């Protein structure tokens, strides 16, 4: 024997509606680059004045090891209430924090080259600020 029972289909739904809207807008654009900081005050590569290590060995060492060192650095605005050594020593920790991978001794000379560079920017800034600054 064999009966012929009718099947039953259950109402199955996805229950997951997606966003829908008809509209178009926008323009084309390209050509942009970023270093990595984009937060601190970084101008443009400036001249790199010699450092005063105190000896002839160190001087020659750096002068010859300048190729393995950066040219620019990152510091904060001197327009803020804070001693110079504050931003000078702080800005130095940033530049070296961006990347070094140098030797154990290099890390030392790297702090001087950067530090001495920070002040060089302020000293020249104070001159222009002495006349006109900003609101």
Burial class (CB in 10 A: 0-12, 13-18, 19+), 92: buried
Structural domains in the chain, CATH included, are 40-135 (1.10.790.10)
Experimental method: NMR
Residue/partner pairs of 102-111 with CB below 8 Å, 24 or more apart: 102/68, 106/65, 106/68, 109/51, 109/53, 109/58, 109/61, 109/62, 109/65, 110/69
- Distance of alpha carbon 127 from its chain centroid, rounded? 27
Are the beta carbons of 91 and 114 closer than 8 angstroms? yes
Phi-psi region of 120 (alpha: psi -120 to 50; beta: other; left: phi over 0): alpha
- Is the distance from CB of 55 to CB of 82 less than 8 angstroms? no
Question: What string of H, E and C letters represents the secondary structure of 88-112?
Answer: HHHHHHHHCCCCCCCCCCHHHHHHH
d(CA 16, CA 25): 27
In the DSSP assignment, the letter for residue 41 is B
Q: How far is CA 96 from CA 69, 106, 108, in A?
A: 10, 11, 10
Q: Which one, of 62, 49, 75, lies nearest residue 107 by Cα?
A: 62
């Amino acid at each position: 024997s064999g009966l012929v029972p009718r099947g039953s289909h259950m109402s199955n739904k996805p229950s997951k509606p997606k966003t829908n809207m008809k509209h178009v807008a926008g323009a084309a654009a390209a050509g942009a680059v970023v270093g990595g900081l984009g937060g601190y005050m970084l101008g443009s590569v400036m001249s790199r004045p010699l450092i005063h290590f105190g000896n002839d060995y160190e001087d020659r060492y750096y002068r010859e090891n300048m190729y393995r060192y950066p040219n620019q650095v990152y510091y904060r605005p001197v327009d803020q209430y804070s001693n110079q050594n504050n931003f000078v020593h702080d800005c130095v920790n940033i530049t070296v924090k961006q990347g070094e991978n140098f030797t154990e001794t290099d890390i030392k000379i790297m702090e001087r080259v950067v530090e001495q560079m920070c002040i060089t920017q302020y000293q020249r800034e104070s001159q222009a600020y002495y006349q006109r600054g900003a609101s």
